[PDB]
């Protein structure tokens, strides 16, 4: 046999393959790029930012509630890639831990404490041959007290780890190698030039060259407490000066 | 139907000639000469490489007759 | 305990809070503040003992803060003022703790609620609360009218308490005085060298 | 019983104490410490009955402990004040803990005073222990509301002091816990008021007042 | 483009600049003129702005008017700096592509060869390093300046 | 060595990166380096060109981004 | 694939290696086979369209019928397989009454729609049981809140939608809506529309005969979920036979 | 104590402006204070001392200057006691002997490092050390402290193989025994450096010294 | 919101007498980073590659290399997310032995603990077993201590332990590096030989993470001391 | 180990400190209340047979508690080799206790015992919800505690003779049967010891 | 697979938003129509089309035309056609997953 297990039980359900890792986890890997949402996160000392797509299909299809940044929480806010679905169902559960937390705890959440949290759980579901590995990957941003802005990405497999620069979706490899180079050649971040980073990114690997309308920005500010989408008017501020940029 | 990975065998008589089949679709022959009324129970068991929409440009889905149709067929 | 009250604005509230609570002789918290949200939307003024108040103040900040970040546009004010009535309805025997809430929720427009320790919510005009803080049945009718004027509302508010602190033993100390507008809490601090003193009761 | 202050100051916490441990007015022991260290970033002092103050310090230190780690935060004092309001609660409020919470977030150092009551109480320079009022009431008194940090050490020192003079439950020596929040310097000997007499002199006695008829090992 | 980006060639071929070499192209007696009493600055905002852009097409109109104010640049020796820094900071950047400047600078290259004796021989060099990177008409232009060097 | 370079260009961060990259994939980064500089018309080999192919032609530099497990 | 006893079509916890799940797949294109149901957004309320399938020729109102109340001012239309609309009905209507009870203000549709789609969503994770094979829509008139409509598939999306289609003809259907203005439009012209729309998709053989159902949740009925007179349904019924001509 | 890093800086701006005579008293400062580990924890305060004092040696080479330097280091070897402690003696030999200030300086100093390495640090450390020794006095050409030191080494560092530095030490020997005209000596040692040499753990440039 | 589980024997023996996903299990571990473990006898050390391949990654507070509590700590190799589950499971154990006994829990207990979770994951079905290897270390009671679990559910003790790629090789690097009665230090600079006799060259500051183990505690050294390190070993 | 109320099972626990060792006596008797009328059956466990808590008063939950916390030490000793310690126990046993609701298990403990093997003694005494006081002085514990940690505090020369010991806990004994009711007649005394357990049986009225 | 046959890899990947704009005008060239400004509706619509299925749409929209009774193609057969190809592709099976 060749051509995945199917004499076998092994992308079927939730257990170890023959060669180690499961066919079905790498898998769930691939169900992100079928969503059509690639998003980059750009980590500066002014702001954390995702930039993604505001972009709508037709004039039936809202904009004034469909969005993919999400604001958990007012310090804390997120963006799904991948299937819509899933991206809902961990968003809400996001959510009610979120304001759970605060309640019992106390303890005001950094970006550490969702992104850990979800992705244990996350972990259950890959563990469980009823329920399937995560069809969405999260990007959180949100102010870490300690560290200062920061930005963190779980993995639909169940890991959490830290970033300065991320990006997942559809060209998950090629944004990631592409943000590298500008992490190399440093930046020294303001609050213009994170958000300048991420557009560029996005714009050259789609190539289809985004416009201010066509994306939404997503800020997590030190002097805002909330989440706050930064909208045309400021992106066009900076859209420009990418295209006087190299 | 072609999701070949197959690092064993495979087959390949009818690689070979999956692939022929969308050479004579493509338009180094025409394709406004040659209609192709093609009937298969799924398109499940189908590969995308056959279906796309420049080989085989409408998808026509047949239910199972109607309550009015039954009594048009008897 | 502390003289909380809450006047009816131009379309919003103007707040009055104290800083003291009192069992007897021994202060349950030598600082209160009353002022603080309890979400974004609402805010509340909490009265009666310190326990009492306490628990009821987490649980109507947990419900809100999970309605407002599900929904996406945020909760109205009159889903707070009932959540507090859910806990009174099992502790209507037990406790009592008279919350008298009031912001304004953007969605519907500005509320005032008054949700008691025995469980109910009503729409008033203004409230004031606490178990001696019931003492200024003048001060407030007198004061309040319909669609009072906001710079007097302001007045009325911070002289109502004053009133209060003098009279009732359970008041005292620092009064926190808010005005609150349409998405907008300000806070001044009266200071505790400024109150008018009680003239001739002897 | 005993007398616990802890105070935020220009600094950081310093925290008071005298020594004694008492089941009641009697003391079961008269060493160890009252103003107990945790883990490195907590230290929280003890006040009014014992068995209830002990165990629910020790109970919210494993609750707080697993929310520092996963979060990745240093410690808050309203986050701590939260823990113990619900705890308490599901206890039913039983028993007679006045609790000091005090730990140092990114921000100021913070301070809170919990009584028993399961109340979310914010102070300003809170002691706890005997009446809550009774100790709160020095704060007020001695401190002009913000003074040096080390003016503000001699400050608390000289205060709990007095209350130790004053009430002679409290005995031995007053330890001062400086706290930052992975810094605790536990200075056993702040103030020694005051201690015993040596007890040189014996009661013991020979066997002929009492005698032993086995001396044996068994297996 | 490859470079590694393509935003500025491919993903975005009209652009605000590209517009602009067109505009201030007629601008130029003018431009040449404010040139020549000195205005280091009126001249290069321009010619930055012009040249963000990696298409030979855009680059290539930008490119010929510059070059006529050059020869007076070139023969005051306070302006002359001045001309140099363009083709080192466009190369460097994102590039630009060598072709469309080449057949321009090739010319400058000639102009500072007759002037003043020494002085002329600092400029040179300079020049002669502005010419180096092309695989293009550059090459026998690179070869021949350093031959005027090796005869004083 | 076979290639003209630009003296901007440094070899050293490219190879670090990866613990190795077999013979073939050292022979085609090289071919595609050489190849992005005749678009440029340059003979000499850039630090940008030369980085870009490293990467490119052979590619998937990082595959444990979010496919670690 | 489709014939099989192991995975595919029995699971949906599989996988595969494009990332597709089939049976929550197959859960969509059972919606398609029955008739078309509409519902627009109007900036003052919603109007739905809906075929009411007369399977039989002894018909009396209401009998199968797809409209349905959440809330008092939620309708819901569904289009699919009955069979798995009627569960979705119960959980649905059960979620607003607690909301009412406890908020004791009228359920916001981005809440509501979000608790749906995650039940229908905790399914099509499963293996362990199938997905609902109807799609659905939630429309209403709140002045807490405004005019919303939401639409909810087999696989657990929610977003708003301000005119949607769900059934056979939706591709179609949907095709009007461009159209139309209907985001600024009273609730009394929008029912003149989704009435002609309906008559001209419906053909012989996506359903023998249909019923025509129209409700209304607007500024009209004053925020109420109501079916619409015999008046109103039958003058929307002459315009779509008029435009049908 | 309070060395921190300006007083690192200060003496590395000192020895950039002047020279050595302006940084010896700041140099006896840094170097006294390193006797704990400096200021709490070990950090770049430790990373930049420990590193300044191993290129220091060696830029204007010979000097009253460099000795000076050479006596300060003499408590500080020992009371370290990390993983970098390894790292202070192989730099500071290695560099010395680049530029011999003297014979007696350096003699004496290297004896006192193996002392240290052979009780209580590692064997790898020790291997380093060695081949300075023999490399010293071969230079000076006297084959007769060389020859005596030889036998031991050969004997130890047996124990690791696996390890470019075994290597070295062989080699050395090899050329002094060669010398005497101690031609069986010189024959046995240099084909057992060549045996030590085939591990595949030994780096490029290894290889080519041996040949 | 609908499920009974399933339970279902690819769980159960085969007909070769070993269990069909313990040896995939091993395999995982295999391909992880790899990690060392040595016990000093003056404090325990352990060492395992920072790294993820791509250093896109911010970690000063994310690590491989986390405290379970005041002086235990855990190193790991293999699978990413399932150590995430088990570092906070852990965690969770060691408190709950915090409140009884005032002392932070034994290695020797602690892995018993951990191993009946590795089995319930082998041994019921519709679950798979962890595919990670732990290195649990501690200083407690006078002396430090070194446990090994593999993924199985089994513990093994040992001074000196390699694990993930060229397990083998680094198990004999140890044996021939490391003598017994040598001190910490000494123990410190082993472990980063270990490391590059098991995956060999180039290693930077954010390459490696090196954690050194007392009864003062657990801590993971800055980027800083690290880089001092690196300078001393071949 | 651990019991319910202080003396209403009688049972009382006196230690003196000897630099070597510690000495411990009790009463040997046994019955509820004033009566004592039986004399065979035992109050202080081994809990490494070298260190030993003891808590006093009711035998039902003496017996009860002392079992039910046994299995759990033993599962700890067998596990990790090094047998926990004097400190493990007093929390272990704090915390036992105040998690019971229904017949509320208050004791007042004495540990008696040197650390594991080696040679360092200690000695405490609980309060009756026993939270833990770390001390290396000198313990008297039962209903009336802070009587015999008075008196226990006064006797000793500074440390005498573990020979000198026996006697003189012996004596504090004697006298205290007669300042309560509760118990009475009959006492043994176990010298604890780093290596050994020397059993005494003292002089009764 | 490996390269020295296969250095150059070059992926003619599904074409843009901006991509499907001119090549659609081009399509537009041949078609009798009444107008077509409709380009901008049919990208937003269009989701993982290429080059197969931007052809398609053009000829699905002319069928329309013969129903209605017109050799010149409706707006509204445009916006209809692009939904009803997007909605069959993807329902059926989607595109394959390889390399890109």
């Given at each position: 046999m060749s051509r995945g297990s199917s004499a076998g039980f092994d992308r079927h359900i939730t257990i170890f393959s023959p060669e180690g890792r499961l066919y079905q986890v790498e898998y769930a890997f691939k169900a992100i790029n079928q969503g059509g949402l690639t998003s980059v996160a750009v980590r500066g000392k002014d702001c954390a930012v995702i930039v993604t797509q505001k972009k709508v299909p037709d004039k039936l299809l809202d904009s004034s509630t469909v969005t ?6 007012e310090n804390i806010g997120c963006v799904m890639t991948g299937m819509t679905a899933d991206s809902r169902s961990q968003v809400q559960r996001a959510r009610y831990e979120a304001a759970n937390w605060k309640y019992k705890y106390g303890y005001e959440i950094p970006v550490d404490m969702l992104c850990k949290r979800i992705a244990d759980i996350s972990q259950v579901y890959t563990q469980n041959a009823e329920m399937r590995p995560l069809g969405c990957c999260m990007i959180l941003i949100g102010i870490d007290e300690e560290q200062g802005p920061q930005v963190y990405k779980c993995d639909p497999a169940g890991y959490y780890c830290g970033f300065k620069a991320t990006a997942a979706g559809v060209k998950q490899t090629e944004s990631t190698s592409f943000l590298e180079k500008k992490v190399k050649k440093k930046f020294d971040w303001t609050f213009e030039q994170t958000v300048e980073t991420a557009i560029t990114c996005l714009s050259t690997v789609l190539s289809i060259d985004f416009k201010p309308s066509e994306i939404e920005v997503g800020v997590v500010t030190v002097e805002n407490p909330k989440f706050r989408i930064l909208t045309e008017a400021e992106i066009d501020a900076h859209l420009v000066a990418l295209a006087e940029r190299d | 139907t072609k999701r070949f990975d197959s690092e064993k065998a495979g087959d390949r008589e009818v690689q070979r000639t999956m692939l022929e089949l969308l050479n004579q679709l493509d338009g180094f022959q025409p394709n406004t000469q040659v209609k192709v009324i093609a009937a298969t129970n799924r398109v499940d068991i189908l590969d995308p490489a056959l279906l796309r929409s420049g080989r085989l440009d409408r998808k026509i889905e047949f239910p199972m007759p109607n309550e009015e149709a039954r009594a048009r067929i008897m | 305990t502390t003289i909380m009250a809450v006047q009816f604005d131009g379309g919003v509230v103007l707040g009055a809070d104290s800083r003291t609570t009192t069992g007897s002789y021994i202060a349950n918290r030598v600082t209160d503040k009353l002022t603080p949200i309890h979400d974004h939307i609402f805010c509340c003024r909490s009265g009666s003992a310190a326990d009492t108040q306490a628990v009821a103040d987490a649980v109507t900040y947990q419900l809100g803060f999970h309605s407002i970040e599900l929904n996406e546009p945020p909760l109205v004010h009159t889903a707070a003022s009932l959540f507090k009535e859910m806990c009174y309805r099992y502790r209507e025997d037990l406790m009592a703790g008279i919350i008298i809430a009031g912001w304004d929720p953007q969605e519907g427009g500005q509320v005032y609620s008054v949700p008691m320790g025995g469980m109910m919510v009503r729409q008033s005009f203004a409230i004031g609360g606490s178990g001696s803080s019931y003492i200024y049945g003048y001060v407030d009718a007198t004061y309040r009218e319909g669609m009072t004027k906001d710079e007097c509302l302001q007045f009325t508010a911070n002289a109502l308490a004053l009133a209060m602190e003098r009279d009732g033993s359970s008041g005292g100390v620092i009064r926190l005085a808010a005005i609150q507008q349409s998405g907008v809490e300000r806070q001044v601090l009266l200071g505790d060298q400024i109150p008018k003193v009680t003239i001739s009761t002897l | 019983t005993t007398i616990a202050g802890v105070v935020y100051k220009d600094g950081i916490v310093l925290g008071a104490d005298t020594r004694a441990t008492e089941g009641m007015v009697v003391a079961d022991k008269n060493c160890s410490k009252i103003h107990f260290i945790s883990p490195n970033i907590y230290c929280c002092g003890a006040g009014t009955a014992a068995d209830t103050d002990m165990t629910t310090q020790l109970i919210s230190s494993n609750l707080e402990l697993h929310s520092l780690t996963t979060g990745r935060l240093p410690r808050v004092v309203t986050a701590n004040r939260m823990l113990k309001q619900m705890l308490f609660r599901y206890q039913g409020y039983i028993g007679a803990a006045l609790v000091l919470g005090g730990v140092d977030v990114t921000g100021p150092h913070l301070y809170s005073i919990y009584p028993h009551g399961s109340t979310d109480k914010l102070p300003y320079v809170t002691m706890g222990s005997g009446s809550l009022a009774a100790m709160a009431v020095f704060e007020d008194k001695f401190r002009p509301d913000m003074e040096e940090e080390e003016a503000k050490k001699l400050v608390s020192e000289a205060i709990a002091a007095g209350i130790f003079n004053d009430l002679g439950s409290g005995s031995n020596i007053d330890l001062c816990v400086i706290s930052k929040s992975k810094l605790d310097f536990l200075r056993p000997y702040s103030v020694p008021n005051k201690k015993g007499t040596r007890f040189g002199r014996y009661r013991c006695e020979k066997g002929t007042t009492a005698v032993l008829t086995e001396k044996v090992t068994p297996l | 483009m490859a470079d590694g980006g393509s935003e500025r060639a491919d993903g975005r071929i009209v652009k605000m600049e590209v517009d602009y070499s067109a505009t201030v192209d007629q601008r130029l007696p003018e431009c040449e003129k404010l040139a020549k009493e000195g205005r280091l600055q009126e001249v290069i905002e321009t010619l930055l702005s012009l040249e963000k852009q990696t298409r030979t097409a855009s680059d290539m109109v930008s490119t010929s008017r510059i070059l006529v104010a050059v020869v007076k640049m070139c023969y005051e020796a306070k302006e002359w700096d001045l001309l140099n820094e363009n083709i080192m900071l466009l190369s460097k950047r994102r590039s630009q592509l060598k072709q469309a400047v080449a057949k321009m600078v090739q010319q400058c290259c000639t102009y500072v060869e007759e002037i003043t004796d020494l002085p002329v021989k600092l400029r040179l060099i300079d020049t002669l390093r502005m010419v180096t990177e092309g695989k293009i008409y550059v090459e026998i232009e690179r070869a021949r300046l350093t031959k005027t060097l090796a005869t004083i | 060595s076979k290639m003209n370079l630009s003296e901007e260009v440094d070899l050293e961060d490219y190879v670090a990166r990866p613990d190795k990259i077999s013979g073939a994939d050292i022979n085609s980064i090289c071919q595609e380096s050489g190849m992005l500089a005749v678009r440029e018309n340059r003979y000499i080999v850039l630090a940008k060109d030369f980085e870009k192919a490293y990467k490119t032609v052979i590619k998937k530099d990082e595959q444990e981004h979010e496919f670690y497990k | 694939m489709s014939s099989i006893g192991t995975g595919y079509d029995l699971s949906a916890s599989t996988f595969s290696p494009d990332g597709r799940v089939f049976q929550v797949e197959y859960a969509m294109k059972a919606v398609e086979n029955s008739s078309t149901a509409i519902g627009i957004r109007c900036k003052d309320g919603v109007v739905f369209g809906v075929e009411k399938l007369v399977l039989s020729k002894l018909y009396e109102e209401g009998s199968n019928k797809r409209l349905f109340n959440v809330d008092r001012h939620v309708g819901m239309a569904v289009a699919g397989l009955l069979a798995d609309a009627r569960s979705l009905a119960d959980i649905a209507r059960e979620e607003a009454s607690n909301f009412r009870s406890n908020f004791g203000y009228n359920i916001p549709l981005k809440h509501l729609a979000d608790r749906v789609a995650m039940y229908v969503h905790a399914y099509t994770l499963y293996s362990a049981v199938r997905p609902f094979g109807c799609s659905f829509m939630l429309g209403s008139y709140s002045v807490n809140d405004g005019a919303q409509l939401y639409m909810i598939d087999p696989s657990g999306v929610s977003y708003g939608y301000w005119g949607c289609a769900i059934g056979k003809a939706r591709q179609a259907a949907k095709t009007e809506i461009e159209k139309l203005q209907m985001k600024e439009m009273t609730c009394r012209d929008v029912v003149k529309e989704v009435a002609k729309i309906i008559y001209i998709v419906h053909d012989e053989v996506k359903d023998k005969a249909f019923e025509l159902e129209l409700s209304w949740v607007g500024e009209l009925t004053k925020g109420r979920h109501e079916i619409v007179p015999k008046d109103v349904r039958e003058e929307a019924e002459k315009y779509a036979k008029e435009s049908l001509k | 104590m309070a060395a921190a890093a300006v007083v690192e800086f200060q003496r590395a701006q000192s020895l950039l402006s002047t020279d050595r005579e302006a940084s010896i008293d700041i140099l006896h400062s840094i170097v006294k204070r390193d006797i704990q580990e400096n200021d709490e924890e070990a950090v770049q305060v430790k990373e930049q001392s420990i590193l300044e004092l191993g290129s220091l040696l060696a830029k204007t080479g010979q000097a009253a200057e460099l000795g000076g330097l050479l006596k300060y280091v003499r408590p500080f070897l020992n009371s370290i006691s990390k993983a970098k402690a390894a790292r202070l003696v192989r730099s500071l030999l290695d560099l010395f002997l680049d530029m011999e200030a003297a014979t007696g300086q350096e003699v004496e100093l290297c004896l006192e490092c193996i002392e240290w390495a052979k009780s209580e640090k590692r064997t790898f450390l020790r291997q380093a050390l060695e081949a300075r020794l023999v490399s010293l006095y071969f230079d000076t050409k006297r084959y007769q402290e060389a020859l005596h030191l030889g036998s031991q080494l050969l004997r130890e560092l047996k124990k690791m193989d696996d390890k470019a530095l075994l290597v070295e030490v062989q080699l050395l020997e090899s050329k002094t025994y060669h010398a005497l005209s101690n031609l069986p000596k010189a024959r046995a040692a240099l084909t057992s450096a060549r045996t030590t040499a085939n591990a595949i753990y030994c780096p490029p440039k290894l290889q080519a010294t041996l040949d | 919101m609908a499920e009974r589980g399933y339970s279902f024997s690819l769980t159960t023996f085969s007909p070769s007498g070993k269990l069909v996903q313990i040896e995939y299990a091993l395999a995982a571990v295999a391909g992880g980073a790899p990690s060392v473990g040595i016990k000093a006898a003056n404090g325990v050390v352990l060492a395992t590659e920072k790294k993820q391949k791509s250093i896109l990654y911010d970690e000063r507070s994310v690590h491989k290399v986390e405290p379970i509590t005041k002086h235990i700590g855990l190193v790991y190799s293999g699978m990413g997310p399932d150590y995430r589950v088990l570092v906070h499971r852990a965690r969770k154990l060691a408190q709950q032995y915090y409140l009884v006994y005032q002392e932070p829990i034994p290695t020797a207990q602690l892995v018993q603990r951990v191993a009946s979770v590795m089995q319930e994951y082998t041994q019921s079905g519709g679950v798979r077993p962890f595919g990670v290897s732990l290195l649990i270390c501690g200083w407690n009671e006078g002396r430090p201590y070194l446990f090994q679990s593999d993924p199985s559910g089994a513990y093994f003790a040992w001074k000196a332990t390699a694990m993930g790629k060229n397990y083998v090789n680094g198990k004999t690097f140890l044996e021939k590096r490391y003598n017994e009665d040598l001190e910490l230090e000494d123990a410190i600079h082993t472990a980063i030989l270990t490391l590059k006799e098991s995956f060999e060259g180039q290693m930077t500051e954010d390459n490696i993470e090196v954690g050194i183990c007392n009864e003062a505690g657990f801590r993971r050294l800055t980027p800083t001391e690290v880089r001092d390190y690196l300078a001393a070993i071949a | 180990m651990s019991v319910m109320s202080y003396n209403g099972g009688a049972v009382m626990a006196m230690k003196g400190k000897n630099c070597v060792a510690i000495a411990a006596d009790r009463r040997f008797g046994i019955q509820a209340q004033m009566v004592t009328t039986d004399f065979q059956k035992i109050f202080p466990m081994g809990d490494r047979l070298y260190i030993g808590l003891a808590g006093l008063a009711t035998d039902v939950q003496t017996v009860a508690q002392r079992l039910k916390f046994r299995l759990n030490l033993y599962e700890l000793k067998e596990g990790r080799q090094i047998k926990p310690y004097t400190l493990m126990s007093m929390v272990a046993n704090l915390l036992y206790e105040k998690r019971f609701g229904p017949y509320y298990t208050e004791p007042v403990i004495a540990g008696l015992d040197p650390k594991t093997f080696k040679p360092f003694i200690c000695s405490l005494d609980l309060i009756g919800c026993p939270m833990v006081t770390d001390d290396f002085v000198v313990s008297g514990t039962c209903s009336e505690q802070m009587y015999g940690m008075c008196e226990s505090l006064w006797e000793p020369n500074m440390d005498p003779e573990h020979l000198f010991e026996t006697i003189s806990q012996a004596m504090l004994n004697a006298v205290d049967r007669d300042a309560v009711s509760g118990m009475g007649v009959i006492v043994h005394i176990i010298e604890k010891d780093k290596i050994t357990t020397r059993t005494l049986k003292a002089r009764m009225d | 697979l490996r390269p020295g046959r296969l250095d150059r890899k070059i992926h003619i990947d599904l074409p843009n938003e901006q991509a499907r704009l001119d090549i659609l005008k081009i399509h537009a060239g041949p078609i009798t129509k009444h107008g077509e400004i409709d380009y901008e509706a049919i990208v937003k619509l269009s989701d993982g089309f290429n080059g197969a299925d931007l052809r398609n749409v053009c000829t699905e929209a002319g069928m329309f035309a013969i129903r209605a009774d017109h050799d010149f193609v409706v707006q509204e057969d445009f916006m209809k056609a692009v939904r009803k190809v997007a909605d069959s592709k993807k329902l059926e099976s989607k595109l394959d997953y390889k390399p890109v």
């Open positions: 993919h940044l999400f604001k958990i929480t | - | - | - | - | - | - | - | - | - | -």
